[PDB]
Amino acid sequence: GPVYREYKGFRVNDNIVADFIGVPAVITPGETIEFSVFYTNRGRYAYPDTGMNLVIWFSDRDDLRREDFKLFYKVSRADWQEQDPAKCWDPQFPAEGGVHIACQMSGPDGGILSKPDGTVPLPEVESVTAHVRLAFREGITSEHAGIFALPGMLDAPGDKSIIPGLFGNVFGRLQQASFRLGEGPSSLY
Amino acid sequence: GPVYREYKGFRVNDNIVADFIGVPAVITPGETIEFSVFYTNRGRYAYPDTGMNLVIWFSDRDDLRREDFKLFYKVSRADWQEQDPAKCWDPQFPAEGGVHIACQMSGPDGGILSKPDGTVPLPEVESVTAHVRLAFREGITSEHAGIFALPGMLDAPGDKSIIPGLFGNVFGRLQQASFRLGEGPSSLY
């Protein structure tokens, strides 16, 4: 099996990486944006089952909850679905401030890598995409926030997920997108 | 010399990587977009001649052809040029469905790295960019598509390219940008 690192209490394989496309640096409260995010096997160990997790983090307030935004996603060429609030981690409060909401966005990918039994194996060099639609409710703002892509994997076939609500017992390399939720910049000239 | 990996029947050097800037997650049919893509030598072997290849992929249909889109590019500081359909690979059809069209975007870079003899060497840490204009014809859509960046390189001076229509006998690390070709998202609220 592959080499894992310890981070908090979890096992991380940096060879499974994630990339964002189309995240804006400023998001307007109330408006819907669409971006894509995808994880790729940059190693040589083929995982038997995989799925994406998305983390939304506010650094400057701790009152954000799952119900403060609407979240839809589509795994590659499968159909759109609404992200399930039951498949989220409970709010986490880092000692450095803020709160983050981790949401599972897994499932079949339209039969590209996914198999009849529902698994999404991930051979080397291959990738899985989530097209993601996101909107925060009006009336909430943050001056330093982030979306994080947290790829999840099952190391061995038959393994169970280890964080309640999220996919995987091991995880890939965390990828970040920093943004502000608020008003865009006024003209400097 | 550098170490290569096998992928299909080709040689890949993961130290030559590519990055996209400004690709949108949703592209309107008929509309022209501009993005940039660039490849960087993150290794220590200086390549004698290099050029970018671009792949357009639809996962949910197989009728896309080179004639269905218009494509222009400029290599770093050189002038714009129309991409040559003769310098493309034939449509490729993955066993899981869909189609992709690989298009060569090579040429001198405006005298930054390029040499009088026409080659574009790539010393370590240096990079080459393509500014890219792209438009799909109206009446064609895809709900899960991608642009892939495929850096191509000549291992030795005087080598010949190995995929007909594309540049290079060895290749860098494939980079992806997933998007949809269709209508932007309606409001979630």
Added chain:
Amino acid sequence: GPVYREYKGFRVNDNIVADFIGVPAVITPGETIEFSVFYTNRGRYAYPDTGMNLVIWFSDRDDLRREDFKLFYKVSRADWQEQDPAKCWDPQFPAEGGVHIACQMSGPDGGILSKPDGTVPLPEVESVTAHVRLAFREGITSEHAGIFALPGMLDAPGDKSIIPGLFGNVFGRLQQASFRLGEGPSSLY
């Protein structure tokens, strides 16, 4: 402690990397954009003090100076500030032409990683963000330009910065965003 590579006359630790969010591939002269940029410790050596440097590069002209654009930034959840022209490197002129202007954008991050003594240590997996507002004066254009992210670190606490005007005596992995400064693309159809 970490291993460094030589580049020009400086020391580079490729484990400190940087990512861009929201840079457009075409910037309108006179218009203000906001993007984000952040550096992440992908290694295991915790640097005692860190800060971001940003380089603005035109490849096709050499008359650009710091006074030709306006530049503001905000380190994570700290406050907005105007970038200080005295904390810039002198204009640098590549032998092939063009000019680039390197600007320091360091400072505390709102007490996320920053400490009372003002330092910004960077433990493993952690990151620091700069939200950036940028505008070029109208009447200036470039057909191949770039923003470069240059993380600076102080290896060991007592070290002093090695490039006057910039933060750090060692540096992280340079990250690029290529763009044009001018008019957007006219329709190809």
